[PDB]
């Protein structure tokens, strides 16, 4: 912890004297004998998370279900739509289909 | 250093850690009740927040002007030196000061009563300084040392310096622009 | 909101209008006053 000299207000340093450890100024004679226990606790942040993920419900909390893919036609699906390329005047979609765990991903 | 360190399933007792931690630093060499070893209680080192100076020991809300004047009047009879700021011009004419409509300050007025101070219901504090009432607000609260001194140059080369007391609080005065403007809107 | 308390009179004095200064110490807290330490020299340019 920062502690400052009552005289000149520079920063104190800890050093050792002939009877005690002392807080001492570097620029004036002031010293302060450590007579008793003095402490400073940091209390850092612990690693709070454990973070298991990738569950199927964490995958299918998106709108689409019971639609039709051009590959395997299954109802349990995971869709996506893009538009952010205006060279593509048509729309952009991508689909995931996992009822039979077939796993297609096409345009 | 042997790297293959071994570990066990047993659960650490809470007090066993508490008493080990206790025994690690509760030892004290304070037995030296001697001059050098002694320490001056009025010259402790300054912990940085000045309201919170005490790091070593023998063992906040923000007040307002109505609470400021109540504690100095009702709670205590003892007088207190304040430090109040004024607006840039006080609402007067410089009395035969050889002018231009320039600034009118306290250096141009005379001794005698200059006004009255009205503490209203619900914390409103005004300074009626003639026909206009100013507004009094607590300023930034200082927590360092301030001393009010009188420097008198009784002779060309020598004189007297005298400390009158410590100044704690700082007040701020400001014109009520809404009431000044609501007389004649523009 | 009538002025329920403390219609306090405000006066003005000029006898110390050109002698009064204000010394403030930016590095010294309000507890540790200089009331006890003896002083040796006080110098000023008016
Ligand atoms: Zn120092
Ligand atoms: Zn598919």
From Swiss-Prot, chain A:
- The segments annotated as TFIIS-type zinc fingers are 65-107
Which family does the record claim for this protein?
A: Belongs to the archaeal RpoM/eukaryotic RPA12/RPB9/RPC11 RNA polymerase family.
> What is one GO biological process annotated to this record?
innate immune response
Keyword list, A-Z: Antiviral defense, Disease variant, DNA-directed RNA polymerase, Immunity, Innate immunity, Leukodystrophy, Metal-binding, Neurodegeneration, Nucleus, Transcription, Zinc, Zinc-finger
- InterPro entries, alphabetically? DNA-dir_RNA_pol-M_15_CS, Rpa12/Rpb9/Rpc10/TFS, Zn_ribbon_RPB9, Zn_ribbon_RPC11_C, Znf_TFIIS
Motif Hairpin location, chain numbering: 88-89
Q: Where are the zinc fingers (C4-type)?
A: 5-28
Q: Where in the cell is it found?
A: Nucleus
Any one GO CC term of the record:
cytosol
Q: Which disease is it linked to?
A: Leukodystrophy, hypomyelinating, 21: An autosomal recessive neurodegenerative disorder characterized by global developmental delay, loss of motor, speech and cognitive milestones in the first decades of life, and diffuse hypomyelination of the white matter and atrophy of the cerebellum and corpus callosum observed on brain imaging. Clinical features include nystagmus, ataxia, dystonia, and spasticity. Other more variable features are feeding difficulties, poor overall growth with microcephaly, optic atrophy, and seizures. The disorder is progressive and may lead to premature death.
Q: Name one Pfam family in it.
A: Zn_ribbon_TFIIS
What role is this protein assigned?
A: Core component of RNA polymerase III (Pol III) which synthesizes small non-coding RNAs using the four ribonucleoside triphosphates as substrates. Can mediate Pol I proofreading of the nascent RNA transcript. Anchors into the Pol III active site to constantly monitor transcription fidelity, cleaves mis-incorporated 5'-ribonucleotides and restarts the transcription process. Once Pol III reaches the poly(dT) termination signal, can induce Pol III clamp opening and transcription termination.
Species name: Homo sapiens
Q: Which PROSITE patterns does this UniProt record tie to the protein?
A: RNA_POL_M_15KD (PS01030), ZF_TFIIS_1 (PS00466), ZF_TFIIS_2 (PS51133)
Entry's CDD domains? Zn-ribbon_RPC11
Positions with a binding annotation for Zn(2+) 2? 69, 72, 98, 102
Q: Which gene encodes it?
A: POLR3K
Q: Does the keyword Zinc-finger apply?
A: yes
Main location class: nucleus
The protein's matches in Gene3D superfamilies, at most eight in alphabetical order, are given as:
2.20.25.10
Q: Where does Zn(2+) 1 bind?
A: 5, 8, 25, 28
Swiss-Prot record, chain B:
Instruction: Using the record's annotations, give every residue carrying the modification Omega-N-methylarginine.
Output: 1
UniProt PTM comment: Sumoylation on Lys-43 can serve as a signal to mark misfolded Pol III for proteasomal degradation.
Q: Where is this cross-link: Glycyl lysine isopeptide (Lys-Gly) (interchain with G-Cter in SUMO2)?
A: 43, 54, 184
* Recorded superkingdom: Eukaryota
> Localized where?
Nucleus
**Physiological role:** DNA-dependent RNA polymerase catalyzes the transcription of DNA into RNA using the four ribonucleoside triphosphates as substrates. Specific peripheric component of RNA polymerase III (Pol III) which synthesizes small non-coding RNAs including 5S rRNA, snRNAs, tRNAs and miRNAs from at least 500 distinct genomic loci. Assembles with POLR3E/RPC5 forming a subcomplex that binds the Pol III core. Enables recruitment of Pol III at transcription initiation site and drives transcription initiation from both type 2 and type 3 DNA promoters.
Q: According to its UniProt record, which protein family does this protein belong to?
A: Belongs to the eukaryotic RPC4/POLR3D RNA polymerase subunit family.
Q: How does it assemble?
A: Component of the RNA polymerase III complex consisting of 17 subunits: a ten-subunit horseshoe-shaped catalytic core composed of POLR3A/RPC1, POLR3B/RPC2, POLR1C/RPAC1, POLR1D/RPAC2, POLR3K/RPC10, POLR2E/RPABC1, POLR2F/RPABC2, POLR2H/RPABC3, POLR2K/RPABC4 and POLR2L/RPABC5; a mobile stalk composed of two subunits POLR3H/RPC8 and CRCP/RPC9, protruding from the core and functioning primarily in transcription initiation; and additional subunits homologous to general transcription factors of the RNA polymerase II machinery, POLR3C/RPC3-POLR3F/RPC6-POLR3G/RPC7 heterotrimer required for transcription initiation and POLR3D/RPC4-POLR3E/RPC5 heterodimer involved in both transcription initiation and termination.
* Protein's name according to its UniProt entry: DNA-directed RNA polymerase III subunit RPC4
Curated annotation (Swiss-Prot), chain C:
Q: Where in the cell is it found?
A: Nucleus
What does this gene product do? DNA-dependent RNA polymerase catalyzes the transcription of DNA into RNA using the four ribonucleoside triphosphates as substrates. Specific peripheric component of RNA polymerase III (Pol III) which synthesizes small non-coding RNAs including 5S rRNA, snRNAs, tRNAs and miRNAs from at least 500 distinct genomic loci. Assembles with POLR3D/RPC4 forming a subcomplex that binds the Pol III core. Enables recruitment of Pol III at transcription initiation site and drives transcription initiation from both type 2 and type 3 DNA promoters.
Q: How does it assemble?
A: Component of the RNA polymerase III complex consisting of at least 17 subunits: a ten-subunit horseshoe-shaped catalytic core composed of POLR3A/RPC1, POLR3B/RPC2, POLR1C/RPAC1, POLR1D/RPAC2, POLR3K/RPC10, POLR2E/RPABC1, POLR2F/RPABC2, POLR2H/RPABC3, POLR2K/RPABC4 and POLR2L/RPABC5; the stalk composed of two subunits POLR3H/RPC8 and CRCP/RPC9, forming a structural mobile part that protrudes out of the core and functions primarily in transcription initiation; and additional subunits homologous to general transcription factors of the RNA polymerase II machinery, POLR3D/RPC4-POLR3E/RPC5 heterodimer and POLR3/CRPC3-POLR3F/RPC6-POLR3G/RPC7 heterotrimer.
Please state what the protein is called. DNA-directed RNA polymerase III subunit RPC5
Q: Which organism is it from?
A: Homo sapiens
Gene it is expressed from:
POLR3E
Query: Parent protein range shown?
Result: 6 to 51 of 708
């Amino acid at each position: 912890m920062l502690l400052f000299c009552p005289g000149c207000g520079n920063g104190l340093i800890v050093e050792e004297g002939q009877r005690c450890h002392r807080f001492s100024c570097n620029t004036c004679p002031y010293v302060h004998n450590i007579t008793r226990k003095v402490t400073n606790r940091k209390y850092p942040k612990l690693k709070e998370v454990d973070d298991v993920l990738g569950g199927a419900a964490a995958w299918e909390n998106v709108d689409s279900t019971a639609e039709s893919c051009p590959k395997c036609e299954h109802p349990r699906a995971y869709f996506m739509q893009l538009q952010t390329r205006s060279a593509d005047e048509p729309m952009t979609t991508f689909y995931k289909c996992c009822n039979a765990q077939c796993g297609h991903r096409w345009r | 250093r042997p790297e293959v360190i071994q570990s066990h399933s047993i659960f650490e007792q809470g007090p066993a850690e508490m008493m080990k931690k206790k025994g690690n630093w509760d030892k004290t060499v304070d037995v030296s009740d001697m001059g050098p070893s002694h320490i001056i209680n009025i010259k402790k080192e300054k912990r940085e927040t000045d309201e919170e100076t005490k790091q070593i020991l023998r063992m906040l809300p923000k007040d307002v002007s109505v609470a400021e004047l109540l504690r100095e009047l009702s709670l205590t009879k003892e007088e207190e030196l304040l430090f109040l700021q004024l607006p840039d011009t006080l609402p007067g004419q410089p009395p035969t000061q050889d002018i231009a409509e320039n600034a009118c300050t306290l250096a141009d007025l005379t001794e005698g009563q200059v006004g009255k101070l009205l503490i209203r219901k619900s914390g409103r504090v005004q300074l009626l300084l003639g026909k206009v009432t100013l507004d009094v607000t607590m300023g930034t609260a200082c927590s360092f040392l301030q001393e009010l001194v009188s420097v008198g140059l009784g002779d060309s080369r020598t004189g007297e310096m005298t400390v009158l007391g410590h100044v704690k609080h700082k007040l701020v005065c400001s014109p009520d622009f809404e009431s000044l403007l609501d007389h004649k809107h523009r | 909101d009538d002025p329920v308390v403390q219609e306090i009179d405000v006066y003005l004095a000029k006898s110390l209008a050109e002698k009064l200064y204000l010394f403030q110490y930016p590095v010294r807290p309000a507890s540790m006053t200089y009331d006890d330490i003896p002083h040796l020299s006080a110098k000023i340019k008016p």
